[PDB]
């Protein structure tokens, strides 16, 4: 799956995340999330606060309401399509997913 991460300054990182691998997982293989994780990626922290293109959010496993309550626990501007990068699984069919990461991931 083609995985691009859009930072703030406009710089991007294109990876290859296989099926079942979460963006937070491959970000550790290319050295991108190098910031440790509180919920260890178990959907329970705002460490992976990022904005996923509203084109893959309704296609990738949109977690039930358990996250919708955590999404209301970040320090950055939430978005209708906000998402906790760890609770996401990439797939070759969803190749081209664009992720937007803010300066305040908290
Ligand atoms: S890394 Fe903890 S919520 Fe995603």
Swiss-Prot record:
- InterPro entries named in the record: 2Fe-2S_ferredoxin-like_sf, 2Fe-2S_ferredoxin-type, Adrenodoxin-like, Adrenodoxin_Fe-S_BS, Beta-grasp_dom_sf
Q: Provide the residue positions that the database annotates as binding [2Fe-2S] cluster.
A: 39, 45, 48, 86
Q: Which gene encodes it?
A: camB
UniProt KW Metal-binding keyword: yes
Q: What is this protein called?
A: Putidaredoxin
Q: Per the UniProt entry, what species is this protein from, by scientific name?
A: Pseudomonas putida (Arthrobacter siderocapsulatus)
Q: Does the keyword Electron transport apply?
A: yes
* Function according to Swiss-Prot or TrEMBL: The oxidation of camphor by cytochrome P450-CAM requires the participation of a flavoprotein, putidaredoxin reductase, and an iron-sulfur protein, putidaredoxin, to mediate the transfer of electrons from NADH to P450 for oxygen activation.
Q: What domain of life does the UniProt record list for this protein's source?
A: Bacteria
Cofactor list: [2Fe-2S] cluster
What remark does the entry make about the cofactor? Binds 1 [2Fe-2S] cluster.
- For this chain's UniProt record, which GO biological process terms are given? P450-containing electron transport chain
Report the GO terms under cellular component.
cytosol
Residue ranges of domain 2Fe-2S ferredoxin-type in the record: 1-105
Similarity-based family: Belongs to the adrenodoxin/putidaredoxin family.
GO MF term set: 2 iron, 2 sulfur cluster binding; electron transfer activity; metal ion binding
Q: How does it assemble?
A: Monomer.
Q: Mind listing the UniProt keywords for this protein, alphabetically?
A: 2Fe-2S, Electron transport, Iron, Iron-sulfur, Metal-binding, Transport
